[PDB]
Symmetry: D3
Subunit: 156 residues, 6 copies
């Protein structure tokens, strides 16, 4: 199955700037399905867990202050090769490097002690699975049809 799920976090800079809907519309427009979503306020413990791979890096602390600065919207996107697709849609990590057309390329630039880059997107299928489990319980993820789902069915 080419169908997979990735985790997206609309970071504090996007929420504060009122970019939630515009970010969501890009995924819906692409044809990606939102199977799970909710606004939460990430606490230090969960933040460090999500970014446990950066535990031993200089910028770590700035990154924690950042993702926990205000509530965020975490969501699970479902679709064909969603992980690489959503990663492509996100753009380069540093928004100034992200190309015009991507989420970071159009909405990101300014930074604090952390490289504020609009959203988070699972980098691999493996990370996707770990991160989705860290923010969502099975009961929060749903299976339902989007309008055009019928159109793509593999013949008879």
């Amino acid at each position: 199955s080419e169908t997979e799920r990735t985790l997206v976090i609309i970071k504090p800079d996007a929420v504060v700037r009122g970019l939630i809907g515009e970010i969501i519309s890009r995924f819906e427009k692409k044809g990606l399905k939102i199977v799970g979503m909710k606004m939460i306020w990430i606490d230090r413990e969960l933040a460090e867990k999500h970014y446990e791979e950066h535990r031993e890096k200089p910028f770590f602390k700035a990154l924690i202050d950042y993702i926990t600065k205000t509530p965020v919207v975490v969501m699970v996107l479902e679709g064909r090769y969603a992980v690489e697709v959503v990663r492509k849609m996100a753009g380069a990590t540093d928004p100034k490097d992200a190309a015009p057309g991507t989420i970071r390329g159009d909405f990101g630039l300014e930074v604090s002690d952390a490289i504020c880059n609009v959203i988070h997107a699972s980098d691999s299928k493996e990370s996707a699975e770990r991160e989705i489990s860290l923010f969502f319980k099975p009961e929060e993820l749903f299976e339902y049809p989007r309008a055009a789902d019928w159109f793509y069915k593999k013949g008879i």
Copy 2:
């Protein structure tokens, strides 16, 4: 006290058509704050609690089927006179009657045995209170600053 909170439900028809982001952006652009939000799939019991006032109407059952058809996004919006403002933004109950510019006016039209109208909005501060308590726990509602909040203070 002009700042109030209202409960909005992005109904199954909007979720299916991929209109969640567009509806949300209208509120963010208005200056309204999202203090709570989550995708959930409402069951008949909860749906009937939310729509209690319509239990004696002919269209009740079709309304419950409709609101429970697929997942929805329930959210709480905060801002100056949020309740009447969101209701103003929503438009007439029957999409064909909603004026261009409103959410129901621009996105709604087609119906089933229920009058599909994109979103739900609390009709009073009292109703919003009741509706928010049905879908959220205080721990799911947040107090934080939006970018321009400082511009209006003092």
Copy 3:
């Protein structure tokens, strides 16, 4: 029978300014279905047939010149109460009078010897029938499903 068809003409002024896509998207977003559509250049004879009701008005000639000025896009839209809905979406005949949110309200203003107002919309089911027969053959009108058609059925 709430499903009806209406004839819309994206007038020369909209075609020239590159507003075809924006006008079409408003209908698609409303939930209306495009069952027919083609770019054509109307000649005086056909233009006068379409505008028969105005043959005795002072602005008739300028209206024919206007509608035949450049190519236009004629199209048929299908949906619940399509006729009154599209008319609602269009707005007042004179763009300066059309409310913000409507197509004439947002895109129209400037005029010539004719009141240039972006698009034309049938004013009744009877008129739509007549107007569609003027521009299309049954073979140019289609019956097919739009993505969310299933959501409203049964």
Copy 4:
């Protein structure tokens, strides 16, 4: 003489929130012409001249603080009945009262000790004249063709 000019001020609240381009595009899309425009920071003396009619109102001081809070974009728009049209596009003075579709309706809501409403628009041809003379010299206003100007001539 239907072509007129009106003075619009994109107020501090719109400049701060990054709404300058969106407000301008609404006018360009309507068919209105920008014949003058510049970002400036109004001082109390000039602000009070612009708002002379309100010197005896309770909210005067807060209005001057507001309009002089940060830089603004003052601009002159030209077009058929520009004054009433822009006022129509702006919407009710109090954003909560402005209808969806209007600039104040879509972008305004929150207030301070002043009713923050995104933009200012001359209320008459006479007022526009006065207001334009306050912010521009004839050398800052231009006469040039917009892309579709030819479509409406002759």
Copy 5:
């Protein structure tokens, strides 16, 4: 003359999803001129003719079912180097590979038995001429000025 014409087909997935206007707006915004356009329902015979170059390929049949699934909107775009430009605007054949900013990059992803990719765009000047002739008669293509045409005239 740098001015040329290419054929664009807003495939069934775009029509069904209500993306006709948004696709048209991108070309109009670019400055391209629509000289011909119409909604038709492509029959097997015409579809196989249009895609006669893929006649001897595996995916052929899936492609035919696809382009003939529902009505489509065929249109002729005119403008400076329109063929390469419109091809660039379209994005990579498989939507998941198309870059954010292109038509396939923003609107395409999911596939059926066919690689559903929003629109069709002539790949060469030669193909453009053959395809335009296959869908449009000379009487359906017009010559008229767009608003800003006067602005680009080559001095006196």
Copy 6:
């Protein structure tokens, strides 16, 4: 300081086509700050000064006629690495080559005797300084906070 200022000129083709607001919105959306802006009608003398580096090139004259054809909107953009960022946002000099997503990629294509390309963007920090000084007096450039400025402050 990563913070810098670049000069942008919304050329005559953009003004005539009513693209001023859409071009401005892209920079505001990116997070760039407009510290100076005004509509002017560039005279030959100032135009040749701005493009003094192309004085000894063939296309020079066409370029002058172009930028002075109608009023333009000149503005000063402020933000982190604004010069390279705005240059990236602009796209390739010839609009047909600019990628979908950039300003020239989405709005530019047709040309006159000059390669009409929507806007001008300082190519270097050095050019930025010379050009900004050529169109703006210190009194026309302001320092004020944008809504989200507080969010990016470097911790305590």
